[PDB]
Design an enzyme around this catalytic site. Structure first.
Site, PDB file in Angstrom:
ATOM      1  N   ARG A   1       0.695  -1.319  -0.031  1.00 15.05           N
ATOM      2  CA  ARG A   1      -0.038   0.100  -0.059  1.00 15.05           C
ATOM      3  C   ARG A   1       0.958   1.212   0.157  1.00 15.05           C
ATOM      4  O   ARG A   1       0.359   2.387  -0.284  1.00 15.05           O
ATOM      5  CB  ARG A   1      -0.791   0.144   1.277  1.00 15.05           C
ATOM      6  CG  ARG A   1      -2.071   1.147   1.255  1.00 15.05           C
ATOM      7  CD  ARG A   1      -3.115   0.843   2.318  1.00 15.05           C
ATOM      8  NE  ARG A   1      -2.591   1.287   3.544  1.00 15.05           N
ATOM      9  CZ  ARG A   1      -2.726   2.302   4.183  1.00 15.05           C
ATOM     10  NH1 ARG A   1      -3.680   3.429   3.537  1.00 15.05           N
ATOM     11  NH2 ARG A   1      -2.345   2.738   5.340  1.00 15.05           N
TER      12      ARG A   1
ATOM     13  N   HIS B   1       3.626   1.901   2.599  1.00 11.82           N
ATOM     14  CA  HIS B   1       4.571   2.372   3.745  1.00 11.82           C
ATOM     15  C   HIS B   1       5.865   2.092   3.580  1.00 11.82           C
ATOM     16  O   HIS B   1       6.838   2.887   3.922  1.00 11.82           O
ATOM     17  CB  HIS B   1       3.995   1.458   4.966  1.00 11.82           C
ATOM     18  CG  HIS B   1       4.995   1.421   5.925  1.00 11.82           C
ATOM     19  ND1 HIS B   1       5.267   2.372   6.774  1.00 11.82           N
ATOM     20  CD2 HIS B   1       5.847   0.682   6.435  1.00 11.82           C
ATOM     21  CE1 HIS B   1       6.124   2.452   7.545  1.00 11.82           C
ATOM     22  NE2 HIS B   1       6.414   1.126   7.693  1.00 11.82           N
TER      23      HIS B   1
ATOM     24  N   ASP C   1      13.996   2.835  13.994  1.00 15.35           N
ATOM     25  CA  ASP C   1      12.279   3.208  13.744  1.00 15.35           C
ATOM     26  C   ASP C   1      11.836   1.590  13.903  1.00 15.35           C
ATOM     27  O   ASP C   1      11.029   1.049  13.033  1.00 15.35           O
ATOM     28  CB  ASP C   1      12.123   3.535  12.257  1.00 15.35           C
ATOM     29  CG  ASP C   1      10.782   3.691  11.877  1.00 15.35           C
ATOM     30  OD1 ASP C   1      10.002   4.179  12.668  1.00 15.35           O
ATOM     31  OD2 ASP C   1      10.473   3.926  10.599  1.00 15.35           O
TER      32      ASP C   1
ATOM     33  N   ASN D   1       7.178  -2.560  11.110  1.00 14.29           N
ATOM     34  CA  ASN D   1       8.669  -2.512  10.335  1.00 14.29           C
ATOM     35  C   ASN D   1       9.199  -3.804  10.399  1.00 14.29           C
ATOM     36  O   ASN D   1      10.523  -3.942   9.901  1.00 14.29           O
ATOM     37  CB  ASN D   1       9.429  -1.240  10.718  1.00 14.29           C
ATOM     38  CG  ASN D   1       9.256   0.111  10.311  1.00 14.29           C
ATOM     39  OD1 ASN D   1       8.716   0.013   9.094  1.00 14.29           O
ATOM     40  ND2 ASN D   1       9.377   1.050  11.038  1.00 14.29           N
TER      41      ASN D   1
HETATM   42  C1  LIG Z   1       3.347  -9.453   1.015  1.00 15.27           C
HETATM   43  O1  LIG Z   1       3.329  -8.249   1.272  1.00 15.27           O
HETATM   44  C2  LIG Z   1       4.660  -7.406   1.436  1.00 15.27           C
HETATM   45  C3  LIG Z   1       5.907  -8.205   1.290  1.00 15.27           C
HETATM   46  C4  LIG Z   1       7.162  -7.916   1.293  1.00 15.27           C
HETATM   47  N1  LIG Z   1       8.203  -8.542   1.010  1.00 15.27           N
HETATM   48  C5  LIG Z   1       9.611  -7.957   1.261  1.00 15.27           C
HETATM   49  C6  LIG Z   1       9.732  -6.707   1.482  1.00 15.27           C
HETATM   50  C7  LIG Z   1       8.509  -5.938   1.569  1.00 15.27           C
HETATM   51  O2  LIG Z   1       8.916  -4.668   1.734  1.00 15.27           O
HETATM   52  C8  LIG Z   1       9.957  -4.013   2.224  1.00 15.27           C
HETATM   53  C9  LIG Z   1      10.617  -4.225   3.553  1.00 15.27           C
HETATM   54  C10 LIG Z   1      11.836  -3.585   3.738  1.00 15.27           C
HETATM   55  C11 LIG Z   1      12.466  -2.744   2.741  1.00 15.27           C
HETATM   56  N2  LIG Z   1      13.461  -2.412   3.040  1.00 15.27           N
HETATM   57  C12 LIG Z   1      14.448  -2.233   4.066  1.00 15.27           C
HETATM   58  O3  LIG Z   1      13.857  -2.721   5.215  1.00 15.27           O
HETATM   59  C13 LIG Z   1      15.753  -1.489   3.883  1.00 15.27           C
HETATM   60  C14 LIG Z   1      16.918  -1.548   4.810  1.00 15.27           C
HETATM   61  C15 LIG Z   1      16.840  -1.999   6.507  1.00 15.27           C
HETATM   62  N3  LIG Z   1      17.883  -0.892   4.231  1.00 15.27           N
HETATM   63  C16 LIG Z   1      18.957  -0.564   4.679  1.00 15.27           C
HETATM   64  N4  LIG Z   1      17.533  -0.612   3.183  1.00 15.27           N
HETATM   65  C17 LIG Z   1      18.168   0.015   2.106  1.00 15.27           C
HETATM   66  C18 LIG Z   1      18.240   1.330   2.308  1.00 15.27           C
HETATM   67  C19 LIG Z   1      19.266   1.864   1.032  1.00 15.27           C
HETATM   68  C20 LIG Z   1      20.411   1.379   0.429  1.00 15.27           C
HETATM   69  C21 LIG Z   1      20.092  -0.368   0.787  1.00 15.27           C
HETATM   70  C22 LIG Z   1      19.303  -0.869   1.593  1.00 15.27           C
HETATM   71  C23 LIG Z   1      16.465  -0.961   2.775  1.00 15.27           C
HETATM   72  O4  LIG Z   1      15.844  -0.913   1.841  1.00 15.27           O
HETATM   73  C24 LIG Z   1      11.934  -2.632   1.601  1.00 15.27           C
HETATM   74  C25 LIG Z   1      10.652  -3.316   1.312  1.00 15.27           C
HETATM   75  F1  LIG Z   1      10.002  -2.944   0.148  1.00 15.27           F
HETATM   76  C26 LIG Z   1       7.349  -6.523   1.751  1.00 15.27           C
HETATM   77  C27 LIG Z   1       6.100  -5.546   1.631  1.00 15.27           C
HETATM   78  C28 LIG Z   1       4.800  -6.158   1.634  1.00 15.27           C
HETATM   79  O5  LIG Z   1       3.753  -5.563   2.043  1.00 15.27           O
HETATM   80  C29 LIG Z   1       4.019  -3.993   2.073  1.00 15.27           C
END
Ligand SMILES: COc1cc2nccc(Oc3ccc(NC(=O)c4c(C)n(C)n(-c5ccccc5)c4=O)cc3F)c2cc1OC
Length: 280
Positions: free
Chosen positions: A36, A38, A154, A159
Site C-alpha cells: 500500500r 508504507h 524506527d 517494520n
Molecule cells: C506481501 O506483502 C509484502 C511483502 C514484502 N516482502 C519483502 C519486502 C517488503 O517490503 C519491504 C521491507 C523492507 C524494505 N527495505 C528495508 O528494510 C531496507 C533496509 C533495512 N535498508 C538498509 N534498506 C536500504 C536502504 C538503502 C540502500 C540499501 C538498503 C532498505 O531498503 C523494503 C521493502 F520493500 C514487503 C512488503 C509487503 O507488503 C507491504
C-alpha cells in the site's frame, strides 16, 4: 530519472560491486506492485542464479534519490546491510545502480507481509505464546544488530516482516509514540532508545496491533512520559512480560535491559507458555 553514474567515485564503486545485481540475474515486474506504500514503491521481482533457479523477491524503487550525494549514501547503506546475516534481520539480496531510472533495493519476498497487519487480521489466530514468540524473534534480530553496533531508529511492529515459515525479520533499519524519552527531547538515538521502541513493539504484539496511547496527542506524549505514566498492561499480557515492558521504558536509558538480557528474559517467559498456532 537520469543519474550520471560516471560522476560516482571509483573507490566507492569498487567497494559496492559485491552488493550490485542486475538484468543478467534480476527480472523486475514493473507492472505488478507489492503493498500500500508504507515501504515505498515496491514491485514483484524474480532473481535467478547461474543455472536458472528462481527466487521470489521484492524490488523497492528509491524514487526520491536525485543527486550523486544521495546515490553515494545509498551505496554505503547497501554495503553495510549486505554484511548482515541473521535469521531475524531482513536480507539484502542486492542493489541496482542504473543509468536510467531510480536506484533499486532487492529483498527476499515476505509472504505474510508486516507483523502489525498479520496480527490485526482477525482471520489469524495467534495464541499468547505465538505473540511472545514473535517478540522473542524481534529481540534476537535486535541483539544481532546491536552487536554489530547498528542503531535501528524506527523499530515497530509495522517494520518487522513475516516470511512463509513465520520467521520474523526486523526491517526498515538505517513515530513519536515509539520514541524514547531522551529521543523526544534531545533527538539522540542509541541502542537504548531502540530498547524503548521494542517495549512499545511488545505492547503492540500483546494487543494484536492496537494503537499505542490512543487518548493522548502526539504533542502531549513527552509530558505524559515525564509524569511517569506508561502504556497499560494488555488483556493478554502476563505480568512478567509487562514487567519487561516497564523496564524497557525506564526514564534513565542506561538502566534499560540490553537486547542480550531481553532475549534471555523473554526466552524464559516463552518456555513457560504452551499452545502455539504459528511455529517457527
Ligand atoms: C506481501 O506483502 C509484502 C511483502 C514484502 N516482502 C519483502 C519486502 C517488503 O517490503 C519491504 C521491507 C523492507 C524494505 N527495505 C528495508 O528494510 C531496507 C533496509 C533495512 N535498508 C538498509 N534498506 C536500504 C536502504 C538503502 C540502500 C540499501 C538498503 C532498505 O531498503 C523494503 C521493502 F520493500 C514487503 C512488503 C509487503 O507488503 C507491504
Amino acid at each position: 530519472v537520469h543519474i550520471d553514474l560516471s560522476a560516482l567515485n571509483p573507490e566507492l564503486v569498487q567497494a559496492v560491486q559485491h552488493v550490485v545485481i542486475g538484468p543478467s540475474s534480476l527480472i523486475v515486474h514493473f507492472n505488478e506492485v507489492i503493498g500500500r506504500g508504507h515501504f515505498g514503491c515496491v514491485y514483484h521481482g524474480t532473481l535467478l542464479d547461474n543455472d536458472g533457479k528462481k527466487i521470489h523477491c521484492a524490488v523497492k524503487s528509491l524514487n526520491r534519490i536525485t543527486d550523486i550525494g544521495e546515490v553515494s549514501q545509498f551505496l554505503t547503506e547497501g554495503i553495510i546491510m549486505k554484511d548482515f546475516s541473521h535469521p531475524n534481520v531482513l536480507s539484502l539480496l542486492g542493489i541496482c545502480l542504473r543509468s536510467e531510472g531510480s536506484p533499486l533495493v532487492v529483498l527476499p519476498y515476505m509472504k505474510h507481509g508486516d507483523l502489525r497487519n498479520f496480527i490485526r487480521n482477525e482471520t489469524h489466530n495467534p495464541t499468547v505464546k505465538d505473540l511472545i514468540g514473535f517478540g522473542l524473534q524481534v529481540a534476537k534480530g535486535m541483539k544481532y544488530l546491536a552487536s554489530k553496533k547498528f542503531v535501528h531508529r524506527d523499530l515497530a511492529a509495522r517494520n518487522c516482516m513475516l516470511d512463509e515459515k513465520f520467521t520474523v525479520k526486523v526491517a526498515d533499519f538505517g513515530p513519536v509514540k515509539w520514541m524514547a524519552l531522551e529521543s523526544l527531547q534531545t533527538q539522540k538515538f542509541t541502542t537504548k532508545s531502540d530498547v524503548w521502541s521494542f517495549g512499545v513493539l511488545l505492547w503492540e504484539l500483546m494487543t494484536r496491533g492496537a494503537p499505542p496511547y490512543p487518548d493522548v496527542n502526539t504533542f502531549d506524549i513527552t509530558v505524559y512520559l515525564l509524569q511517569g505514566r506508561r502504556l497499560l498492561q494488555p488483556e493478554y499480557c502476563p505480568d512478567p512480560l509487562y514487567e519487561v515492558m516497564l523496564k524497557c521504558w525506564h526514564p534513565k536509558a542506561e538502566m534499560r535491559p540490553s537486547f542480550s538480557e531481553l532475549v534471555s528474559r523473554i526466552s524464559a517467559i516463552f518456555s513457560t507458555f504452551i499452545g502455539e498456532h504459528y511455529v517457527h
